[PDB]
């Protein structure tokens, strides 16, 4: 993947779309996304287009749906797993009020680095702490140093794709109780539709048959209510009730 | 669409699936919607399929999608146009706290008695003020009564297709500043993507283009920020900013 391991050549569904067609999916972009996009993440977006990995870019559309939710549950404080170039954290440091916080957490700075002039030119640098670390250690430094009002509103998941459930049991802590818990990527292209699939590489392979696995166990959780959405790659939504 | 005497036999769009096959649409549904809906909603979405307009039904995956944006935004009073027999509403009213309220309009409460036992089953009812009547009318007197302090929190627009730009231009008033306004269909089967779409019933025809000139409008409406969410059959949502 785009942290370590294998190279983008050995990946095989990433020309993939869950629509029914690319021109329903080009339709949406330009009528209701690109129009709506910040000119920082407009350009953020053109340069990773670029990318070796520009597969994993959350697209256009499903970022105004991130920032739509973060600002009608007037979320303050939140934290970002997976960053990348940014253009997820920048979506919600341009959400946040002026006083919002960022945790940010990503193994490689370099992939931030290419975004970050991007993010300094829109004037919300200065909410967002980057801690360049593998997210599971972080999380469970954080659970051992948070106080109940410290708790965060808003997570959006999007690193290792096989690791979500073990940051799912660090998350439903370190998320209040109401706060949103965000997962990306959970119809893995469509892959998920069938317990067996054909073709893929060891580390797609690992990935559907986790999401396979997680979004069952979502569904029967009860510290959580959940909604999957089928925007991007699929986005579950879950709700802390307890 | 669903009006008395109407033969669903005579129109084209039916069974709402913007995916890219059957089968992943019903993965999401047997995997993260029924598991998560309610008993009630279930006997309602039931009896419904043996309408003639069952096909009109929000589907569960969309239902539990705006379950979560109203319990995320702490929603309390709604208005709901275009009722038919009841999943968006049920929805809508389990959603909200024991003295929520919610206005449901629509022209024909016959639907609505449909899946009022279902409703009542809930112990929701008590929540739904019923208005058989068109839409735009009630909307009107609605900005001769209300003030802020009776501003909704929440709209959810699903009713006669080539009315939503009228409908829109009560509801920028009628809900608070940060409230929400969502459109029902604005992917319409995905044949809004094309500027030609052979093969449709005229009305079809009327809403694909109102559709059209939706999004458009839509997108460049500064009192509101927005996001498509492809979803159903499409949802926009809308945030009122002034
Ligand atoms: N174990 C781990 N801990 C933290 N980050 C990880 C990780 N494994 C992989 N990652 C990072 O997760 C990212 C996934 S791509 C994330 C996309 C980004 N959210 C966007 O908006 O486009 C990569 O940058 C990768 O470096
Ligand atoms: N002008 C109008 N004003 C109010 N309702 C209207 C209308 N024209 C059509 N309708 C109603 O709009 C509904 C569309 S179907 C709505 C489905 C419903 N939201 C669900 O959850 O399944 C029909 O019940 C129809 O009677
Ligand atoms: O002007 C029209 C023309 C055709 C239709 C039928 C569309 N297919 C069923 C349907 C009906 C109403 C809905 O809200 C919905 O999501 C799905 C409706 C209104
Ligand atoms: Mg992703
Ligand atoms: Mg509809």
Chains 1, 2 share one sequence.
């Not at 749906?65 to 253009?87: C, D, H, P, Q, W």
Request: net charge negative.
């Amino acid at each position: 993947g785009p942290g370590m391991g294998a190279s983008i050549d050995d990946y095989s569904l990433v020309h993939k779309n869950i629509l029914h067609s690319e021109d329903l999916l080009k339709y949406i972009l330009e009528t209701s996304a690109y129009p709506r996009e910040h000119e920082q993440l407009k350009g953020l977006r053109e340069v990773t287009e670029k990318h070796e990995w520009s597969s994993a870019l959350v697209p256009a559309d499903e970022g105004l749906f991130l920032s739509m939710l973060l600002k009608l549950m007037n979320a303050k404080r939140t934290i970002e797993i997976g960053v990348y170039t940014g253009y997820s954290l920048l979506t919600t440091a341009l959400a946040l009020p002026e006083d919002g916080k960022i945790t940010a957490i990503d193994v490689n700075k370099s992939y931030y680095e290419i975004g970050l002039p991007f993010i300094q030119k829109a004037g919300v640098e200065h909410k967002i702490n980057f801690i360049e670390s593998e997210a599971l250690p972080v999380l469970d430094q954080m659970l051992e140093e948070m106080k109940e009002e410290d708790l965060y509103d808003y997570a959006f998941v999007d690193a290792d794709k096989s690791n979500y459930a073990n940051y799912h049991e660090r998350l439903v802590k370190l998320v209040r109780i109401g706060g949103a818990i965000l997962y990306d990527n959970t119809l893995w292209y469509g892959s998920v539709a069938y317990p067996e699939y054909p073709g893929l590489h060891p580390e797609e392979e690992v990935a559907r048959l986790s999401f396979r696995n997680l979004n069952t166990f979502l569904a029967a959780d009860p510290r959580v209510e959940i909604s999957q959405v089928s925007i991007g790659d699929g986005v579950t939504i879950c709700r802390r009730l307890y």
